[PDB]
């Protein structure tokens, strides 16, 4: 009869993300006239490390088109992007790794990253390290582009949505064992409080639906309805199937 650990996560007190050492939000440049009609040249100044993020972050300086000053945009660095490299962003930009282009102005089978779902949301898709979006189709009439997502999902998005050529740098990061609890400790120390995880079968019945009993066991099906309520969704929620991928 006690509020369980996943229900306490939404109150956001000790389960907030640890955001002191992060460099800022990584976004694309704002979709302005220069990117909508031509291109703009920025410069990679630093490739830095973002805390909690597996991917390195490029700091790219553009000239402000309407005032005399410099705008520093924070990009997710694509693999091969180097300091001092010019980055071109706009409809008329070229097919180079690091360049920011609308997806309608881009051929088929092109690998892109930091892809807007809607034109002007400044980067939504394929942002984690090593991830990319394949362009798998164009529907020029009532402009739409079919893309393939890193989960394998096909998705039709707008041709005016912008992506960045290349894959996200930092790939292969989950290819290393952590080997030890301290490396997971320092990994999650700058993400958020979600580790270590006590199992619900190891708790009392007051703490979890899986809690209690004279042996640690579940006792009802771990598969939970989508139409179940908070406190009940502790297991394999709305599972179409279970078990190993074996035919």
């Amino acid at each position: 009869g006690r509020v369980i650990r996943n229900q306490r996560k939404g109150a956001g007190s000790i389960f907030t993300s640890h955001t002191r050492l992060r460099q800022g939000a990584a976004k694309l440049r704002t979709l302005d006239y220069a990117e909508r009609h031509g291109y703009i040249r920025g410069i990679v100044k630093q490739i830095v490390h973002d805390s909690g993020r597996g991917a390195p972050l490029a700091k790219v300086v553009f000239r402000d088109p309407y005032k005399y000053r410099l705008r520093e945009e924070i990009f997710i660095a694509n693999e091969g992007v180097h300091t001092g490299q010019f980055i071109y962003a706009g409809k008329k930009a070229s097919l180079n790794v690091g360049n920011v282009l609308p997806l309608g102005s881009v051929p088929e089978g092109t690998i892109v990253s930091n892809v807007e779902e809607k034109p002007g949301d400044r980067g939504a898709l394929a942002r984690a390290s090593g991830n990319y979006v394949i362009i798998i189709g164009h529907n020029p009439d009532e402009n739409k582009t079919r893309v393939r997502l890193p989960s394998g999902a096909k998705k039709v998005i707008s041709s005016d949505a912008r992506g960045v050529i290349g894959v996200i740098a930092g790939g292969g990061r989950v290819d290393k064992p952590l080997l030890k609890a301290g490396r997971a400790f320092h990994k999650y120390r700058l993400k958020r409080n979600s580790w270590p995880k006590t199992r619900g079968v190891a708790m009392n019945p007051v703490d979890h639906p899986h809690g209690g009993g004279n042996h640690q066991h579940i006792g009802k099906a771990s598969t939970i309805s989508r139409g179940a309520v908070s406190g009940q969704k502790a297991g394999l929620i709305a599972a179409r199937r279970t078990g190993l991928l074996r035919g």
Binding site: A34, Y39, R41, P65, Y68
Partner: protein, 230 residues
């Protein structure tokens, strides 16, 4: 001058920071400005039932200039001349002693909504000017129908401010003539003949026509663009 030289700046994309241009189309206006422009927009976007927007069919500048030229010969008394003729009437009560009546009959425009509606209902108004800018419009919306039923000629005219100018108010919302002097019968007869031509002899057809349904600039452009495409 050989010391001067021509630079010319390249205000393209990606070169030579843009000059000061007119950005008045892009101004984030205050909310009262935005809502008063968008109210005007919405009231003509929607289909307008024919009872309202028989307004904006207005007495145009020429016949309205003639109408105000006649109506400004019948301006009501200011406070100054009322104070003058009250002292003159007090002197008349002192020595003249007709009854109380040294003052003549006054010939003034009739204003005030209840008063002019009473005059129309008693068939005393010879001409009713109705402001087209009255808000709420429900105050004056029944007046073409009541004027038409009583046979009073009405003109919908621009300016509750402008009617207020001749009745010495700020806003008047109506003005009426119920009797004019001997010199102005011909002018009132010409004005009634053109005003009934514009308003009361068109009223049967104007009762049927819905107003509004006006597309915007871009919606009219893409409305005729796909007409060309078809």
């Amino acid at each position: 001058n050989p010391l001067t030289h021509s630079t010319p700046k390249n205000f393209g994309i990606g070169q030579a920071v843009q000059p000061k241009r007119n950005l008045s189309r892009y101004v984030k206006w205050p909310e009262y400005v935005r809502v008063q422009r968008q109210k005007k927009i919405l009231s003509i976007r929607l289909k307008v039932p024919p009872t309202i927007a028989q307004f904006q069919y207005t007495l145009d500048r020429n016949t309205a200039a003639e109408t105000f030229k006649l109506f400004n010969k019948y301006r009501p008394e200011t406070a100054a001349e009322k104070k003058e003729r009250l002292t003159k009437e007090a002197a008349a009560v002192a020595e003249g002693k007709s009854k109380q009546d040294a003052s003549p009959k006054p010939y003034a425009v009739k204003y005030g909504l209840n008063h002019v509606v009473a005059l129309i209902e008693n068939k005393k108004a010879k001409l009713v000017l109705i402001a087209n800018d009255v808000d709420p419009i429900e105050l004056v919306v029944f007046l073409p129908a009541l004027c038409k039923k009583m046979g009073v000629p009405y003109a919908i005219v621009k300016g509750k401010a402008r009617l207020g100018t001749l009745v010495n108010q700020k806003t008047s919302a109506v003005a009426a003539l119920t009797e004019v002097r001997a010199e102005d019968e011909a002018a009132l007869a010409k004005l009634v003949s053109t005003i009934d031509a514009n308003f009361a002899d068109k009223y049967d057809e104007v009762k049927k026509h819905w107003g509004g349904g006006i597309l915007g600039n871009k919606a009219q452009a893409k409305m005729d663009k796909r007409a060309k495409n078809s």
